[PDB]
Amino acid sequence: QLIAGEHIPIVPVFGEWGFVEDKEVYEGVVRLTKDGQRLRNMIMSFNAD
Amino acid sequence: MQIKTKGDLVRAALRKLGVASDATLTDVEPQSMQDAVDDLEAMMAEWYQDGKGIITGYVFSDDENPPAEGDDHGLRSSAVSAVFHNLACRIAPDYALEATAKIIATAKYGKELLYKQTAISRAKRAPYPSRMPTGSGNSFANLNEWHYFPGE
Incomplete structure (x- = not known):
């Protein structure tokens, strides 16, 4: 089905975007704190125990 | 090893005590040797707490085959000295005896x-607890969604 326009109607928004080795990588602000936050959750749970 | 049977172990223990050996002019009547073999079996069974004690390779005699003496003990070359020193210490009280200090020290060292x-x-x-994160630097686990250690 032909649609209107010359461009694909989907617009993407990227955060920290790039190519590492012919492979796309995009990152927000959360991907990089998961380790510290999981550790903090674990230590707080140990202390509550 | 020249000491290859439960009775050989008992004979070595008695020789260490000085009660009886191949050179003595008086020997223990075989009921005494049977009692010593029973003592050895009880001691070894108490050591090897149904698989959770001291592992030696000792083979417990079966009641069907009648004489325990004459059965090979199955111990390695390095356990014979410990076992028969402890046996001398254990069966000294039968003969109104007290194992000498060297025998007691060797028994402790051997055990x-x-x-x-x-x-x-x-x-x-023990493995990592079930609440321990795997880490984002492991790549494979992060991609497999295995973020936490299983545990137990």
Whole structure:
């Protein structure tokens, strides 16, 4: 089905975007704190125990 | 080893005590030897707490085959000295005796040396707790969604 326009109607928004080795990588602000936050959750749970 | 049977172990224990040996002019009547073999079986069974004690390779005699004496003990070359020194210490009270200080020291040394290797094997570290994160630097686990250690 032909649609209107010359461009694909989907617009993407990227955060920290790039190519590492012919492979796309995009990152927000959360991907990089998961380790510290999981550790903090674990230590707080140990202390509550 | 020349000491290959439970009775050989008992004979070595008695010789260490000085009660009876191949050179003596008086010997223990075989009921005494049977009692000593029963003492040895009881001691070894108490050591080997149904698989959770001291591992030696000792083969417990079966009641069907009648004489326990004459059965090979199955011990390695390095456990015979410890076992028969402890046996001398254990069956000294039958003959109104007290094992001498050297025999007691050798018995302690032999028992500790017997448990040394099994202790080294049993000294193991438990796995990571179930609430321990795997880490984002492991790549494979992060991509497989295995973010936490299983545990137990």
